Amino acid sequence: TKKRSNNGRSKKNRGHTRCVRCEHCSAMVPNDKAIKKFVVRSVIDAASLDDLKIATIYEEYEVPKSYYKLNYCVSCAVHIKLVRVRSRWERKIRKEQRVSA
Amino acid sequence: ARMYSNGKGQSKSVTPYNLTYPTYIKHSKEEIVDVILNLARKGTPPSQIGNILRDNYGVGKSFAVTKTKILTLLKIAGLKPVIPEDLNNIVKKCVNIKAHLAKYTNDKSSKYQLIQMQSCLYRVARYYKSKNELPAGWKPPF
Amino acid sequence: MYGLLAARNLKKNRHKRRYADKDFAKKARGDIYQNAVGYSAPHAKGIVTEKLGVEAKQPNSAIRKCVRVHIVRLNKKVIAYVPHDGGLNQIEINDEVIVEGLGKKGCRSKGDIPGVRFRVCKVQKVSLKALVTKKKERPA
Amino acid sequence: IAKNLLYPTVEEIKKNNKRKQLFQEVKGYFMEVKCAGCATLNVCYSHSQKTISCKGCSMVILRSTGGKAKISNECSYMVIS
Amino acid sequence: MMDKLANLCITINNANRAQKRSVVIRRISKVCRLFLESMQKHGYITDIVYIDDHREGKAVVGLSGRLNRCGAICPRYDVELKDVERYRANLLPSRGFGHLIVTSSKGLIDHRECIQHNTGGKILGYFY
RNA sequence: CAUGAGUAACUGGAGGUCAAGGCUGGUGCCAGCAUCCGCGGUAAUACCAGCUCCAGGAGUGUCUAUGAUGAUUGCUGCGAUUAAAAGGUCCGUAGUCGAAGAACAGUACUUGUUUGUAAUGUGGCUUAUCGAGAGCCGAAUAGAACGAGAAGAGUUCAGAGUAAGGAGCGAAGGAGGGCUAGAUUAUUGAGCAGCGAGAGGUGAAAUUUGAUGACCUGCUUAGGAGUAACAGAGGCGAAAGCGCUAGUCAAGAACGAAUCCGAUGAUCAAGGACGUAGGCUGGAGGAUCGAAGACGAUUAGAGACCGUAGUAGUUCCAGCAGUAAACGAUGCCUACGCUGUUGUGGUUAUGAGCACGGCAGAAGAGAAAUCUAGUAGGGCUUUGGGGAGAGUACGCGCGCAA
RNA sequence: UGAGUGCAGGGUUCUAGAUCUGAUACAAGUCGUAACAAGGCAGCUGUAGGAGAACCUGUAGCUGGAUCA
Numbered sequence A: 001t002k003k004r005s006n007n008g009r010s011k012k013n014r015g016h017t018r019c020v021r022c023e024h025c026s027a028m029v030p031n032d033k034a035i036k037k038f039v040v041r042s043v044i045d046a047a048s049l050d051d052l053k054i055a056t057i058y059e060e061y062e063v064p065k066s067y068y069k070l071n072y073c074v075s076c077a078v079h080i081k082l083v084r085v086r087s088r089w090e091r092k093i094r095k096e097q098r099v100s101a
Numbered sequence B: 001a002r003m004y005s006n007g008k009g010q011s012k013s014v015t016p017y018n019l020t021y022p023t024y025i026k027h028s029k030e031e032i033v034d035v036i037l038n039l040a041r042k043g044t045p046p047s048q049i050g051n052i053l054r055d056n057y058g059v060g061k062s063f064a065v066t067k068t069k070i071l072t073l074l075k076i077a078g079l080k081p082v083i084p085e086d087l088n089n090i091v092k093k094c095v096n097i098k099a100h101l102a103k104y105t106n107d108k109s110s111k112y113q114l115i116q117m118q119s120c121l122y123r124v125a126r127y128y129k130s131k132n133e134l135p136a137g138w139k140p141p142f
Numbered sequence C: 001m002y003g004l005l006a007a008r009n010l011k012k013n014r015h016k017r018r019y020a021d022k023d024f025a026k027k028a029r030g031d032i033y034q035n036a037v038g039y040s041a042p043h044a045k046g047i048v049t050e051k052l053g054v055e056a057k058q059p060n061s062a063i064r065k066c067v068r069v070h071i072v073r074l075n076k077k078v079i080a081y082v083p084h085d086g087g088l089n090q091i092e093i094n095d096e097v098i099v100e101g102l103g104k105k106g107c108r109s110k111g112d113i114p115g116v117r118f119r120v121c122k123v124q125k126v127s128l129k130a131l132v133t134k135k136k137e138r139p140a
Numbered sequence D: 001i002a003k004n005l006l007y008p009t010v011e012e013i014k015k016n017n018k019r020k021q022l023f024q025e026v027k028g029y030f031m032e033v034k035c036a037g038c039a040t041l042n043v044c045y046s047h048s049q050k051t052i053s054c055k056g057c058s059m060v061i062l063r064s065t066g067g068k069a070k071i072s073n074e075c076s077y078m079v080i081s
Numbered sequence E: 001m002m003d004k005l006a007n008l009c010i011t012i013n014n015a016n017r018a019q020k021r022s023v024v025i026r027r028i029s030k031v032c033r034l035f036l037e038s039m040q041k042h043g044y045i046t047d048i049v050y051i052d053d054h055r056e057g058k059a060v061v062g063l064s065g066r067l068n069r070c071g072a073i074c075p076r077y078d079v080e081l082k083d084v085e086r087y088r089a090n091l092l093p094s095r096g097f098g099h100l101i102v103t104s105s106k107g108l109i110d111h112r113e114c115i116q117h118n119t120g121g122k123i124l125g126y127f128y
Numbered sequence F: 001c002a003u004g005a006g007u008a009a010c011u012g013g014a015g016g017u018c019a020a021g022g023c024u025g026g027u028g029c030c031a032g033c034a035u036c037c038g039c040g041g042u043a044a045u046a047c048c049a050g051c052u053c054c055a056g057g058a059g060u061g062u063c064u065a066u067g068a069u070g071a072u073u074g075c076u077g078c079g080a081u082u083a084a085a086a087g088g089u090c091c092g093u094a095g096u097c098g099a100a101g102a103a104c105a106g107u108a109c110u111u112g113u114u115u116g117u118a119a120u121g122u123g124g125c126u127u128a129u130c131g132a133g134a135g136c137c138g139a140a141u142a143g144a145a146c147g148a149g150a151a152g153a154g155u156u157c158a159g160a161g162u163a164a165g166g167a168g169c170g171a172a173g174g175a176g177g178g179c180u181a182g183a184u185u186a187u188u189g190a191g192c193a194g195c196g197a198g199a200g201g202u203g204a205a206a207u208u209u210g211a212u213g214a215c216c217u218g219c220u221u222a223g224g225a226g227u228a229a230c231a232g233a234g235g236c237g238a239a240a241g242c243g244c245u246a247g248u249c250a251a252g253a254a255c256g257a258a259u260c261c262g263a264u265g266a267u268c269a270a271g272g273a274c275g276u277a278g279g280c281u282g283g284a285g286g287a288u289c290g291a292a293g294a295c296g297a298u299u300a301g302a303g304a305c306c307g308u309a310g311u312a313g314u315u316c317c318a319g320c321a322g323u324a325a326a327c328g329a330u331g332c333c334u335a336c337g338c339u340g341u342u343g344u345g346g347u348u349a350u351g352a353g354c355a356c357g358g359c360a361g362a363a364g365a366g367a368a369a370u371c372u373a374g375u376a377g378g379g380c381u382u383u384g385g386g387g388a389g390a391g392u393a394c395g396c397g398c399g400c401a402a
Numbered sequence G: 001u002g003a004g005u006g007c008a009g010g011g012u013u014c015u016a017g018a019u020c021u022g023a024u025a026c027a028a029g030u031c032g033u034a035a036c037a038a039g040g041c042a043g044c045u046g047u048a049g050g051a052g053a054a055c056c057u058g059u060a061g062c063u064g065g066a067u068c069a
């Protein structure tokens, strides 16, 4: 029986879409189906900022950040616990997740 | 719906309820009739005659003054073309597509458009060669 | 096909549909005259050539008593079942027996006997029911 | 019958599409435009498919667009039909 | 294009189910007029106005509380006077009430008038 | 009419369907019974018998064809989202189906009168003791002759111009298509320079490569693919499919509006054109990835999964081929239909509309799950009829083969 | 006008045949364990190689998936 109204993907009014590759296992997954995750990570760890304050030559310094978008296939997303199995009424709830660091 | 594609557009223009006589205008009957026959001899299609009469001379639908239709007036004056103007515009588009494909042979989309266009020609031809408006052995310019 | 002047189209279509029915198909396109008892005849005469036994299908546990018959009208050899309690004892090799159908729509196996399609009715011109129950005797 | 169904209010008329009514409505009309300066009058159609220039002075009086045409900044008009 | 007599029937059947009292019907022919005029004679509909719009035509009608259902038959079968009672028993709910309408050389008539005038015709539609 | 007298029932059943016994004795998965479901392994209301009951009765059981059962052949009257079942997409002939207004004609259509039926059958009455039986009466099918009526169907017309179609005009929008000329990085390969011991790969390791200087960091170059992030329940295309920037060449969709022609139209056997990927025939080329083949590990064994390496292919031009879970598993035109919200492109009395969408309820519907599935004798094509064998055999048509 | 009968062929229906190759039933024999749980490498459709055997591997697709995010 049909488990989801949208077939588990975001394609509508189209024939075909570009593929992308999974970060964890390099499998091909369609772009409109892949699980997506955003990361904004400081170059320097929080446990070093108190040393940075005496190491730097400049009057003040702003740490550089690094930015990423990651893609996962279903198997990897479930195994890494980005997503979890949910009850028949919970399946319908849609909410934006946090940006990781 | 549309004949060669999946279209369902609805853009048309409303025909009036009654037609009267355009008393606001600034020419006589005989002047309007002269304007038409001049534009005809210069070689304009009858749909363009209609556009000019509305736009420049200020007459809607070009019949309220004349009690006669544009193509019938051209037959009374003897200015009738050799081929009906619709069938004529279909042969032109075919020629254009064949002239493109002659130099850009690789275009599968243009090939597709040609076979649609060609079908429409013969469907129109069979109408006119039943109403005796074309000779029975007429064939396309190709 | 539902138009007022559509009768010809409708007739030809509906005729072609009927071949999907197994019943109509067999009568039309199968070999309906291959059988000793069937479309051809209600009963068949034949001569006994061997005595035989067969296991019942699961979950039953029995040996069923059967006879090899040469059919006079076709020259095929067929298996038949012998119905009654001591019935096998009423038949000798080279006796003549008359044979009968099991009562299904096509020729099909009945109950727990695998692959046997007929049963014995009379031996040497007399009813097997009378022979077994000792109401009458062999012609001798 | 209902009055609402046989005789719609003028509010209802104005909200509907020009074809989807008890009687279909003409939207195009004719006007007399007068030129700034030379004060000559030209007959024009609303929704014009052609750009139009004033008699005599040759100022472009009316510009054709995808919908209702645009009268040049200084000019003025009256509906005639 | 849809059949005009079919369109008439679905338009009034749905509006009746939705408990509306009046409707506008958008494409009208000669037999559609005569059908509506029949329903008025037997008191199934109350008021009729016709709009002369120069684009086909349209009608505005008031429904009564007595109308349960109506329908057109397609195609329009030919019937002898011997045949009409067969169709009567197939279409109508009771022997006591309701109308089966037939076209004839004497206009539209009901299954009782067929006996009076001694004429078959072609089957058109029904209401009860 | 008159004499004797006192004779005269069987077939199939008794666990359920299905009317009528847990009765007594044998037998112990044996022997048998049972259309179907099922009984019997020592406590059998089902076998073999006794005894009582049941059903029909001068009759009752069995086998075999057929009609019904059966809306499981569907004109009346079934189905095709998931149970069996909508052709991968278009074009198109035969075929079936086709506006409003005003008029006209009678061959179908319906009906009158007259013909057209011995027996059988149908409605009756009369005589054999009764009842079939016999005898007499009346009306009748299809088919044909001559009249009548004109709603529907048909033919014509133009001081008529579809929320029917085609031609054309105006301003604009889009990863729709072909061609020409350019581009920022990245992955490999070579040259040269610096440095002097490990690099790679994994869950953990070994094959493997390095003092002929690896790895990493510079500068030079040579190629062949690709267009990250922006990027979405966004857009375009008949479907398959389409994502860097300029220039160029044809045609199409939608919108605005007093342009022109007038039935030109819907659906479609046969016939024709397109169709991801993998494959095949010839040419160009060859970075990355990698069927086959070869090793290293793991295991009872791995021929596999993992790692090292490696060929055909993967790219382009000219063609052949014709299949996909080619799926929203929902044919194409055309209707009638509740509300709220959010998009994309035009137009706007700024109130709204038109085309193409998404989402959330409701009411109905349905075996439910759910809703492209509500209402319905609108038109046309494809298609299913319990599992298997079988989408297989033989014949035929296409293809170089597959 | 022609019966009968020569000699070649065809069209139909049956039947023989060394040997090979399908299917079905095999109480329970031998070797593994491919599917159904994330079935121990998620499964399935097309196409192409390979292999005691279920099957395995490349390439494009689908969710009837283990994700309506």
Ligand SMILES: [Zn+2]
Pocket (backbone or CB within 6 Å): A022, A023, A024, A025, A026, A027, A072, A073, A075, A076
């Ligand atoms: Zn992965």
Ligand SMILES: [Zn+2]
Pocket (backbone or CB within 6 Å): D035, D036, D037, D038, D039, D040, D054, D055, D056, D057, D058, D059
């Ligand atoms: Zn001026």
